[PDB]
Design an enzyme around this catalytic site. Structure first.
Site, PDB file in Angstrom:
ATOM      1  N   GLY A  35      92.004  39.040  45.708  1.00 25.22           N
ATOM      2  CA  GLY A  35      90.934  39.200  44.750  1.00 25.22           C
ATOM      3  C   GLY A  35      90.737  37.987  43.873  1.00 25.22           C
ATOM      4  O   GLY A  35      91.039  36.863  44.268  1.00 25.22           O
ATOM      5  N   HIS A  47      97.004  31.778  51.395  1.00 27.79           N
ATOM      6  CA  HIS A  47      95.984  30.810  51.702  1.00 27.79           C
ATOM      7  C   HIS A  47      95.536  30.110  50.415  1.00 27.79           C
ATOM      8  O   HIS A  47      96.032  30.397  49.387  1.00 27.79           O
ATOM      9  CB  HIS A  47      94.814  31.445  52.476  1.00 27.79           C
ATOM     10  CG  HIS A  47      93.996  32.414  51.682  1.00 27.79           C
ATOM     11  ND1 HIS A  47      93.143  33.315  52.260  1.00 27.79           N
ATOM     12  CD2 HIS A  47      93.898  32.622  50.362  1.00 27.79           C
ATOM     13  CE1 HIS A  47      92.559  34.037  51.335  1.00 27.79           C
ATOM     14  NE2 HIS A  47      92.990  33.627  50.173  1.00 27.79           N
ATOM     15  N   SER A  80      96.731  36.867  49.614  1.00 23.18           N
ATOM     16  CA  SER A  80      96.133  35.989  48.611  1.00 23.18           C
ATOM     17  C   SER A  80      96.740  36.280  47.241  1.00 23.18           C
ATOM     18  O   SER A  80      97.957  36.185  47.087  1.00 23.18           O
ATOM     19  CB  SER A  80      94.602  36.143  48.594  1.00 23.18           C
ATOM     20  OG  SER A  80      93.993  35.211  47.725  1.00 23.18           O
ATOM     21  N   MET A  81      95.922  36.640  46.249  1.00 25.12           N
ATOM     22  CA  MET A  81      96.457  36.949  44.912  1.00 25.12           C
ATOM     23  C   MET A  81      97.516  38.067  44.945  1.00 25.12           C
ATOM     24  O   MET A  81      98.440  38.081  44.139  1.00 25.12           O
ATOM     25  CB  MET A  81      95.308  37.306  43.947  1.00 25.12           C
ATOM     26  CG  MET A  81      95.752  37.641  42.520  1.00 25.12           C
ATOM     27  SD  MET A  81      96.832  36.412  41.728  1.00 25.12           S
ATOM     28  CE  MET A  81      95.823  34.932  41.885  1.00 25.12           C
ATOM     29  N   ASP A 125      94.732  30.532  56.378  1.00 23.25           N
ATOM     30  CA  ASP A 125      95.448  31.801  56.272  1.00 23.25           C
ATOM     31  C   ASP A 125      96.761  31.751  57.048  1.00 23.25           C
ATOM     32  O   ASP A 125      96.785  31.427  58.230  1.00 23.25           O
ATOM     33  CB  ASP A 125      94.641  32.989  56.818  1.00 23.25           C
ATOM     34  CG  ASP A 125      93.342  33.247  56.064  1.00 23.25           C
ATOM     35  OD1 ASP A 125      93.077  32.626  55.011  1.00 23.25           O
ATOM     36  OD2 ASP A 125      92.604  34.142  56.522  1.00 23.25           O
TER      37      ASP A 125
END
Ligand SMILES: CC(C)(C(=O)NCCSc1ccccc1Cl)S(=O)(=O)c1ccc(C(F)(F)F)cn1
Ligand SMILES: CC(C)(C(=O)NCCSc1ccccc1Cl)S(=O)(=O)c1ccc(C(F)(F)F)cn1
Ligand SMILES: CC(C)(C(=O)NCCSc1ccccc1Cl)S(=O)(=O)c1ccc(C(F)(F)F)cn1
Ligand SMILES: CC(C)(C(=O)NCCSc1ccccc1Cl)S(=O)(=O)c1ccc(C(F)(F)F)cn1
Ligand SMILES: CC(C)(C(=O)NCCSc1ccccc1Cl)S(=O)(=O)c1ccc(C(F)(F)F)cn1
Ligand SMILES: CC(C)(C(=O)NCCSc1ccccc1Cl)S(=O)(=O)c1ccc(C(F)(F)F)cn1
Ligand SMILES: CC(C)(C(=O)NCCSc1ccccc1Cl)S(=O)(=O)c1ccc(C(F)(F)F)cn1
Ligand SMILES: CC(C)(C(=O)NCCSc1ccccc1Cl)S(=O)(=O)c1ccc(C(F)(F)F)cn1
Ligand SMILES: CC(C)(C(=O)NCCSc1ccccc1Cl)S(=O)(=O)c1ccc(C(F)(F)F)cn1
Lengths: 193, 176, 180, 184, 184, 181, 180, 188, 183
Positions: B51, B105, B80-81, B154
């Protein structure tokens, strides 16, 4: 029928010309509305046609445009410089952004504003979406384009590069006399003598 | 109020996309738990595709600021986050469930406007990218140069691979 | 509805419902319920009713790992259907305590996904779903007792199983017909 | 489109000089039009050069390959001229012109990158389609290497992400042979 | 669009030299047009080859079969030429060309697979429509086997999922006879 | 929202208020009501306003701003995640010495954006108005940061991003909060 | 909705908020709150905070007449902005008890409307909005102390006022800066 | 919706026929492309005969100012006189181009109406850019008022006062105002 | 183009000085009507022009461009209503040369007052309402002229939709007679 036809005579018989092809026989090309690939290709093709018919006679490019896509504008720009005939430019209504660029790109001494036309110059606009790595790649490209555009405007107007950079960070509007004063055009056309 | 019930046991769930309000809900729960008892561990379950970075950082800084250790537990996925917050948990207390997956990523973004503004916003997301890589290196024990290489595109990690990478400390399989 | 809540009522008896598409938030609701129940009593069985067409694998795996982690057995009961991730979680129940109702059906298949982007990234994401596929097949072979190759062959395309066929396949342990 | 009746536009007018325009997105129908023009011109005279102006952001690879293979198959040389921009398949078709007859206009730009794609479906099918676009990527890299004079490994490195080139850089890269500035 | 006293669009110009283009998705009306062109060409000269360029992702089977049966019925050989791609029904029609006269351009690609369909309604009708698409699948596999020289069993196996072939692979499989690279 | 009192209501009794997301009239009104209530509970004790916002509507932001200044208690501000545009304006508007950034928050400042459509006469009226708003905002910004008016003006013609350390040096906040002391 | 909510709490302090566009239902909420407060104590001031861009005139007049009818004085406080009907209701507060916060702004202008139909009906509705305009100008004159003719001239087009200017105009009585 | 043709064989649409008789129609909203078509016809006519009058029928609610100015300046530049004839309505830019016709050769049909008013516009963006665009539309407003004054004989001050809001005029009022020279009622 | 040799059926009838006004009246179809009248006038200023009308009405200013053209040109414009002539359609019908306005036996006519709509400041609302009332008055005056009815009768009858059969339209003075079978 939307675009009127005119009838011109023999050579081999009567032939119909839409009003633009008719004006084309007088070495006149119109640049109208937003600049994008296809309308730009049409202009390029007309310039090529006219050079051929006579590489020595001037071409007149009427410009009424809010601007548009830079690469499309450059296909026109490089054609104007490439072909042998001089391309005289005439601004009617307005020439903004790429419209102003192509106006000032006309042959020296042969760039005009109609008395109540206006010109606007400014820096490139753009946008990307994606990974930071790709963002940096596309940001660097548009900065290079901006610089290249500032250089060419500097060349054609006679202004210094720094003057062009400063004056185009934000929208700058010019009346026809202000455009002559700035060097964007050479004079104002008021009446057929 | 099954969640309120578990909140009473110092358990917080971070689920789905990270954005300002769900993040604010996590932050409020952490502040509450700290207050109710500053000495006891907090458990943050994480199941997220990622996000918004600034929203994620509101959680990150709250996690570091408060007195209790925040134990992080990945179930399903932390991408991610989500992976960032997972790895930001207290040393020794970051866990993966056996079949969770982690993905890391670089930032994504987008701007539209004048070239001058494009440069400004490009410089900013590049700075954010740099800061995130430094924080990732810090928490995993990997070098900055290693993180940079591995997060250009990624990168998926199984639970055992995430332990070896230093993203989590171990795998939870069965309760003791 | 029905505002006394009927589910809160059933939860007091260690009964949990997994209903409809599997996704993060309903999965989180289920994980929370399992945690609550384990705490309430770590020795007593939990009953998970499953009626689902499947859903997101990672959300389903949050439920799966929770089921394996907690101390109580999770008895699974297939009602209506258990398809894709629904079938996976059904067979993931405590050995000997996995059930189908007589007219429930089970369906197993391989993962579905999709990506769009650069070829390099396509390769990364294709490689990942293949790893997930392999892992899901291993876990199914493990819980059904089937060879990995049999699971692979049978899940390449949709395979439907009746309740008796699901017992025979090793997906569940038996069929429940009438309360004892 | 600059019309004289006898429907005869400016493009038909330029076709009489063996000049063809590739403009905008590359796709099956606009490409078929390009192939048809090349076939017509070849026959009208198999020995005189054909001039293909390119102003394109790229487009569909298989469609671009219709034009590529036609360009190689026909007898006339196809001289390519980049105006505005030539990106992705546009850059590919530009560099595919006859050796010595590939040009950039002074302020045109070229961009190269790897293929983009997308699929949706079962993992088995995802794998089939992923291996196919990877195979296409390799073929494109080989042809680019062949036409530019760059090594395969160099093309591979340089096309992982979007790569922009000015006209001088495109000459230096081997994408085109020279810059056209003024009519001879 | 391009035109060339008399006036004629460039496709009409190419048609007079027995060239027909099949471009894009196969459907009833574009297929009608191809059938009609084939008939016209046969009348003009029942002995001379007809050249069908194919660049298509596939399409509707019954539409394609109107072209197929027409290709087979008429007297002239229909030479088929793949440019860009020939997938699904596009691949079928490519291989349906006159033996020895089916070609791939060097960088074209071919894809073969089984029929797709869909129905909605009563179980009884579902069974009727399922049985029907299975018959079409069987017939398409028989004809594919016929034109490629592959066994029925090999076609069936190779078409359960999308299978991509390069031009050399298409010659090897028997879908086309050879590759066209350069004119003579 | 979990119950314990909802989590926000629980935090409210501890004089903590959250400003989260875009600033607009109704969320701003909620902030204002919370401040009035807290002033009440104890007109002497500090109020804590956490800020995580991309900005928003200026008049809505000014309702919060003027309330912050009017009430008796000090309003300490804490930026988490980000404080941009009006979010940054409200951050720096906190009680001197009690404005904080969390270590990895970011701050962004710029000039007002707006838009009108209509007759030239009315365009002139609305253009002059947003120009007055711009001037007032720059003065207030100069006031709270310690920067000169001329400096604020130059720095806010375009988006200006600041790390938490840079925000401290600029005077937007007083210091960085890292660990609870 | 921080909870009995925060607004109900402030209501116990004779504080009512007028926020956002003025329309029938939010206006009815305000009228109901005013009636309730008059009841609880008919002599003590009521405080009406206003942050509004304007809205429907008849809706605003339901609030206006209620303000005048009830026994308690209604003190008005502009925060953020009071535009159109918002400015009207601000200036309509009890004499001496109308306030702007320092950085609030006020905007006044004439009514806007629209109709479509037969020329006869257009005339009917034009006559009506013109009467409303006249009535609003008279009332604005009354509460500000400005002459009718001055109001008419100043509201033909949007007129923005800072807080000091609103005091000078007579729209409010003073500026609130810090609590006493 | 098709345009009527005539055979004489050869053929032409009635608009091309009327064009050969130096009649040009300006119909509907003024925008760049329809304006360019009008410009091109004027250029073509100046050509065929630079001495003979051109007749521009105007039926328009108005439109884009810069597009209208491309017509205005062409009318002023070319050698032939451009007689203007209002049928239906000439509003905003339509009224401007009507009053811009050759002195003495500007007409209203008896039941046409004219409307004049100030420019409308709109911008969205930073306050700095808002100021630039507001400044520009005010310059345009001023220039249009000067030109209107020039062609009507009204003072600049009168034009300014009269165009702050929409002002409608009947054909006789437009003559009295100086917008047109007379009313055409019946042909000779 | 529909029925051509493009030279359609309408171009063929134009050569016999027949013009069709069909459907809603708006600027561009009106301009087409005006262009045809101008063309016909030039080809022969002495012969009648025949304008068939089948229209539900439309924009008043577009209609007035047709009206004033009808009155300006030299030829008489004979009008013939087929199907319907409503609102502006009925107006142009009655605007034809007196003695040469016809209804087909089963056509119908409808008359009413103008419709319009504006949105904005009260000041502007007043300006635009005043303007549509002026248009209403002018249209009533013109309807009275051409029908022979008093201004008061037109006003009373057009406050709301008023439908007329072909015989009623003759009796009202909207047309001169009914065309039933060709001479
Ligand atoms: C691409 C060319 C051939 C071109 O535009 N040709 C057609 C001009 S249009 C024309 C020409 C003759 C008669 C009538 C017309 Cl419309 S070119 O003249 O711009 C050109 C392009 C490239 C080269 C060279 F690089 F090969 F030298 C030489 N010439
Ligand atoms: C903003 C604060 C007051 C805060 O979060 N307070 C409430 C914690 S939640 C709580 C507390 C007590 C009882 C119950 C609960 Cl839920 S703080 O403790 O993070 C804080 C923030 C700032 C400062 C200082 F900078 F002024 F020193 C000191 N403390
Ligand atoms: C995260 C934990 C604390 C948890 O889920 N706790 C709450 C269980 S629910 C509950 C508990 C007590 C009373 C009532 C309820 Cl509903 S845990 O038991 O899964 C756990 C997780 C991690 C570790 C360790 F890694 F730190 F060892 C130890 N325990
Ligand atoms: C398909 C062919 C016949 C083709 O393009 N024909 C038409 C050329 S266009 C033309 C030709 C003559 C005169 C005018 C025009 Cl426009 S081909 O030349 O590409 C071709 C294709 C295939 C074979 C062969 F495989 F049968 F040998 C031989 N030639
Ligand atoms: C229907 C017939 C009379 C037919 O197509 N006639 C017209 C051929 S086109 C033609 C013929 C002479 C002169 C000019 C042309 Cl274009 S047919 O019976 O010869 C025939 C022709 C073709 C096919 C098929 F190929 F579609 F199967 C089936 N039947
Ligand atoms: C509008 C007021 C009354 C207000 O907000 N009151 C409620 C504060 S909330 C509160 C107070 C005490 C206990 C509990 C609560 Cl929730 S005020 O105190 O800001 C105020 C506003 C205006 C004036 C004056 F102008 F009349 F002097 C005096 N006081
Ligand atoms: C409509 C009335 C009854 C009204 O608003 N009543 C409720 C006031 S709210 C209230 C009052 C007391 C205690 C508690 C509450 Cl909430 S009134 O007082 O405005 C009223 C309205 C009309 C008349 C009369 F005209 F019949 F005389 C008399 N009184
Ligand atoms: C651009 C010109 C040549 C122009 O509009 N030409 C087209 C006239 S249309 C025409 C004329 C003759 C015969 C047939 C036609 Cl269609 S111009 O007359 O407006 C013109 C424009 C510019 C200059 C000059 F600045 F170079 F002096 C001189 N003349
Ligand atoms: C604008 C005019 C010239 C007009 O309609 N001209 C074209 C008539 S159509 C025609 C004419 C000749 C041959 C063929 C055709 Cl189709 S007019 O007759 O309406 C006209 C308009 C204005 C004036 C005057 F005011 F200058 F006197 C004189 N005449």
């Amino acid at each position: 029928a939307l675009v009127p036809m005119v009838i011109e005579q023999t050579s081999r018989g009567e032939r119909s010309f839409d009003i633009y092809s008719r004006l084309l026989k007088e070495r006149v090309i119109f640049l109208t509305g937003q600049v994008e690939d296809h309308m730009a290709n049409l202009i390029v093709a007309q310039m090529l046609f006219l050079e051929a018919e006579n590489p020595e006679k001037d071409i007149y490019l009427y410009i009424n445009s809010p601007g548009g896509v830079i690469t499309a504008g450059m296909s026109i720009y490089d054609t104007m410089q490439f072909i042998k005939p001089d391309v005289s430019t005439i601004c009617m209504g307005q020439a903004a952004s790429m419209g102003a660029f192509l106006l000032t790109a006309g042959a020296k001494g042969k760039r005009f504003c109609l008395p109540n036309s206006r010109v606007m110059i400014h820096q490139p606009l753009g946008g990307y979406q994606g990974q930071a790595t790709d963002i940096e790649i596309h940001a660097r490209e548009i900065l290079k384009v901006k610089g290249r555009m500032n250089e060419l405007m500097a060349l054609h107007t006679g202004q210094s590069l720094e003057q062009i950079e400063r004056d185009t960070e934000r929208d700058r509007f010019l009346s026809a006399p202000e455009a002559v004063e700035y060097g964007l055009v050479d004079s104002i056309l008021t009446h057929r003598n």
